[model samples]
Target: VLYRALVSTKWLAESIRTGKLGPGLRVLDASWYSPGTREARKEYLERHVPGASFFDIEECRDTASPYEMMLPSEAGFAEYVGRLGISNHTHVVVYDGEHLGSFYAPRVWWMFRVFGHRTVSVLNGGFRNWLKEGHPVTSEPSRPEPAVFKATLDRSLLKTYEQVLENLESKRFQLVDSRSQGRFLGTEPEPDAVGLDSGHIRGAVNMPFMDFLTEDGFEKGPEELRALFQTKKVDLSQPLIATCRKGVTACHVALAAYLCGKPDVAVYDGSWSEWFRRAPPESRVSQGKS
Candidate 1:
């Protein structure tokens, strides 16, 4: 059976011990850090899970976009993952370096799904739990032979800036912004130095990505997630969309919603990065600096 949305460190460790990591299974270090912060690739080179290759978010994006980490085209995505030795048959397990449960791992997980790959999972609790539980780490360099990969994007799961704008009028989907409250309210600066004022789209509700994870970095249980969504006044029955500064942390909301039995969450790929630059000032909602 294919792995579910979350996989345990024990299961991954067993796979490693049995030498089952290759075409049948693959692991990815999907760690990403904000600008001027720690370097993910550097840390990944220093230490990471055995046989796990680093999936560089920055490298896998649309180079033509002025924004950071915009989704790549189908051809571009197929080529990139093929070089990473991934194929349709592989079961991918992704984890991030953030000691707090999961950070950027879910984005990669959702990326695979958007590209029509379903056999993907996030390492539960991420590397933080893997280390805390005394799993092995390796500094060895990974070099897997390239394999052919096919990609077909799911347009329904990907929302565009224009569609989001239309939603303001149609109210077809509930907009959930996953940035911090401070950033959402324009009280704090954005993590990326994009020179755009920090704020959210009009009528968007704030739900910081960190709220989806526990103090130890594991995803909260379904009951807790339901209560959290209720507190935010989000209706699980409605059409849902997620957005963040660069469309990364927004995926945390998708994963959280999926765990709560809502598997069809859509992501605004351009997100605040493109919105703050292109949207009319009236549509950009923010509380002036406190």
Candidate 2:
């Protein structure tokens, strides 16, 4: 009923070669580029994995929210992805070539899980290695079949601003920030530029998403994952609370934790974007501004 959190290029290639792409299989190019960067859709239009549909992380989110990429309502998710031919039973493989992942693809993987669908994975080698190895590619595209994607939103997998605030004080969960050190330390301009303040949650640890990554692979084996996190000062026993500038890269932390055998991880979906914009009175107190 569930698949591995990662699918190697070989596995994906073999599946396609053997014609195993049945109704349940959905390969998505969840490529997204930052502002002034290259266009993700333009790259996809030129070439992408065969049978892959473009999953726009920026578009397939709760548009009404002031915060970018806040989880969509179940109804919104069902209707939108359904148009992309995604359904409750779909086994989705999401990936991107932009920013070399720990980027947009992991966001979609976390989104589906938060919405209560677990049959999802990320492309291990990302789009780079798949192309580097000369497996297959196509420029053709097709409109997706409209399908019903029932979302059973899992509330526990989410963390609101209030919960994060409490965790900061209570130390009930280990909070981790996944932004670059410059941004996390309030030394750099906000890359997303959605707010005036930067820095990180009080009592949180820094483990930039890229720390869990390397050149050509996203799927670090369990022991390797264990070793990577070993550098951090976090207690292995505590539940995790992961956040970033927005909610997107936070999932990169969560996914890494999941692969490392920690399932009690929750993402602060509004992340710093919502946190800084709203700046709950207590939050402002710590940055010494309020």
Candidate 3:
């Protein structure tokens, strides 16, 4: 029942079956899709796990940031979670609706952890597993009594633009880029509305976010993930700072690092979307293979 940073469907079902489920246990459906996919919310409205509330990535994000889905301020995020009826004592269980790979939920998980909330877990295999196991799904929305969620900010897990610049200059932390190889190598088109200059950090390694997951959506085993990184010459023991186009998929890399026993890992909240757009010409590294 106890996996690393994740939990199984059976464990969740057991919690619901028993009266143990209550305000302390908050199940969040953090489903999100790429821009053109109109079916994401529709699918959620049609079927979701019982007692699970929906978390809109865009709506709940930092409204102050120019980039898409940036992490909100501690106060903003606190207010946001408070409205969701989540509190400091809540054991948050987050999941996405799709199979194979869903980066949004884990992004939220990392966000909450950065804001100093413990007892958070990502649902292994997500909604696909529940359906595959023949568990009941309801179109009805979850209703729970409101509870106060007090967020205690942890500044270490979060990296600012200045910190990223310092990291780039000094190379103190291992920069792990979670973007696709094409984007990493400047061969693929950037996905953001505002164009980003082609290139990665000076000493960054490319580890696609999807690489952390199994073919069925569950995350890879810890030892297997460690081996995968070892094959790439990525030192699992080193301090890591994960980055991607925006900051979402970077969290996936951070989560993988955590599972690999590297809790010192951090996420560059401004990632490439912000970095590329704002970095000076000289400060920007070449967009070439490492």
Candidate 4:
């Protein structure tokens, strides 16, 4: 029996100590930073969890999409993970270096699930906690013995921009924005790219991803997650599609929902970046009614 959603540092440490890291269990450092900030790979090269390979979100993406990290082609993803030594049977545990312990790690976690690998989990509290717990760090690079991987995209877990646009009129799903309240409300500047305005999709509810985590970045319990959704006016019983700038933090909402027994949540892969680039003016809602 394995924990599907999250795994504690203590458990992971023991696993590593007992030589459980290999073909059946792959650890990925899925750290990503905002633009013009710290380089994720450079930091990973300096130090990382022992036996963890760097999984660059930017490298495994739809190169054709103008926006960032739209899902890659099924074959592309299969090949990418295969090179990382992941197979259908492998249990992937992803983590990041964000002080919060999670930032982009959930995005990779959601990616694995969307690709039909259900054995993936995010390391709760991330590398920050790993170091806090006195786990050994190593600069030794991982050499993944490449294995063939298979990917069957789970369409239900993904919501395309067109589907989300149609939902605006159909009202088939509750739209949840995972960015901070200021970003969702257009009160703060967006860090996505140049010339993009900060706002949310029409009728989308704000559920800041940070709210789902504790001060140190561990996920809140299910009861707390359920109450947070309610506080944000998000009905847990309804279908949900989460979105955020470039679809990164959006997985935070989906993961939160999953922990709360709503594993059917979908992610808007294009998210606000694509929406702002192509959606009609009326579809983009901001403050001041402008």
Candidate 5:
């Protein structure tokens, strides 16, 4: 099947059966969990989409840094995916087991695109919905022959912590945090933090990642997403930066922003994790910094 940005569960299931998954089509199980939670690869071993291979963000990450799943160097990512048979010519579809919003899938979607591959998409409902429909499942791992997947950076799509600091002063773009209001406001205790207290970057706007996903675990339609931005008073007219706890959910905000006509939304991969890791312990919600 020709690639699309987002495909339905039924379409994916049908594609696997019709041999349409033969070439140019790559399905990656990008499920991931939080610290002290279930392991992503372990769950992938339990069950997954037929012909799907676990795309552990943890495995293919910078390996040297990025807080576990941060964006990797071009050679690092390209070689890993290249050995997994993914190439620029391939149409990639990523899905997850949980985190109804962007989860690990959209992050991978962003990775592929960041590395110069444009034919990538996130499966609409993820593996949860696919399994709920009793679709095909396979414990057998897919073993595709390796191909050379070259990663070329469109550096503009990514933002660094230093860049975030500059943005604070320049206000050159809107800074959007995908964390909950409590975390953004320092009211809630943070999980898996790096020793710094909870709170958002100064002047950043809070737009929790869940806002893009409905109560039933589906992403809202584009029009609904547009209205949601309107409700939040977030303007997509200018450049924007999306940040979250560990660089994961930030992509959710970026996705919504993209659907709402903001394509240049950049992601701060270090996110709160990096911020907290570097900030003094006194940096917290009550600090009056945000």
Candidate 6:
């Protein structure tokens, strides 16, 4: 069978019933929300797909970084994955609770890939689709037999504050903000824990992540996605960096770029939360009229 980056609820159900799932297959719940949106764990405790372990993006953060919820180091990532019963040998399947308008699950999927796991996949349409199909769900929390996970960080997929600064100075790469138009343009209230100074990076372009999805909650087709990038004058061949309130929505932009055949993209993991915290007042740019 051909390997896919996404799997449907039916496929997952079949895998579980056939006993094809074990150490070879791992299910992860990557549900996350904005800081003030209340904890996702409460919902997880209420109900989730059977055998799905929760992966808390916040708990696996880079503690040394000033930015909130930055990517953890390789050792930290390894330890966390180990505790979740995931290993290099596992074919990881990640999902979120949202049937619509959620990117954190894919964000976790991207993080695993960046850490050098090639067998990772996302659960298509997430929990909503699963429930719609009348698949079984359980309020029981998951606890798996522990396994060791080794991490090999791929530095190419991540950008540091210094790299962002260099990109700003040289204009060598395109910076895309995946936040809403109001937030990107500094017209709306910032939703970050570290409040923003109300502006975007100089020469950055806005492409709200939600714009790439359809009414049914699936990602737009590649042709439509390509046109969306073209309309923004975004060059698919050039290196790109994605950013948003935190790092979550930014991964959506990165995923869109990947679907458009631009895998040479990176996420500014600190995103606006860190940018606003560190950006000098003199360096702030005015929101361009769109």
The per-model lDDT (C-alpha) reads 0.88, 0.78, 0.78, 0.89, 0.78, 0.79
**Residue 193 of candidate 1: its Cα lDDT?**
71
Mark the regions of model 6 whose C-alpha exceeds 4 Å error after superposition.
Answer: 1-3, 35-38, 99-101, 192-195, 287-290
Tens-digit lDDT string for candidate 5 (1-290): 32356788888888988867635787888887877887878888878777777897776777677463588789888888887788788888899989563477878888887787878888887787887788888888788788788689998889987888778779888888898888888777778654556788777788988778886667788898888777777787878898888787888887777666666788988888787676554432444444
Give the deviation of candidate 6 from the true structure as CA RMSD: 2.6
Q: What lDDT, from 0 to 1, does candidate 5 have? A: 0.78
Model 4: residue 55 alpha-carbon error in angstroms? 0.5
- Which should have the higher lDDT, number 2 or number 4? 4
Residues 71-90 of candidate 2: C-alpha lDDT, one tens digit per residue: 87888787877888888877
Measured over all alpha carbons after superposition, the RMSD of each candidate to the real structure, in angstroms, is 1.7, 2.3, 2.5, 1.4, 2.7, 2.6
Report clash pairs, candidate 6.
none
Q: Lowest-scoring 10 consecutive residues by lDDT in candidate 4?
A: 1-10
- lDDT by residue for model 6 (151-213), tens: 998888898777888888888889999888887777776754433455777777999988887
| Tens digits of lDDT, candidate 4, 1-290 | 32479999999999988889999999999998876888879989988888999999888999888987698998989999999999999999999988877888899998998998899999999999999987988899889899998899989999988899899999989999998899898888887578887889889988888888898779998999999998988888998899988888899998898888888889988899889888997998888548
Return the TM-score for each candidate structure: 0.96, 0.92, 0.92, 0.97, 0.92, 0.92
* Candidate 2 residue-wise lDDT at 67: 84
CA deviation > 4 Å runs, candidate 3? 1-4, 285-290
Give the winner by TM-score: 4
lDDT of 1 at 113: 93
Lowest-sum lDDT 10-residue window in model 2? 281-290
lDDT of 4 at 52: 92
Better of 3 and 4 by TM-score: 4
> Residue by residue across 1-290, what tens digits does model 3's lDDT show?
22347879899888866655567787888888777864656777888777778888787777777876687778778887787788887788888876665678878888889888868888888887878887677788777777776777787788877898888777878888888877777767676465465677667788998888898888899888888789878887777788888888888877777877776678887888788777775555655533
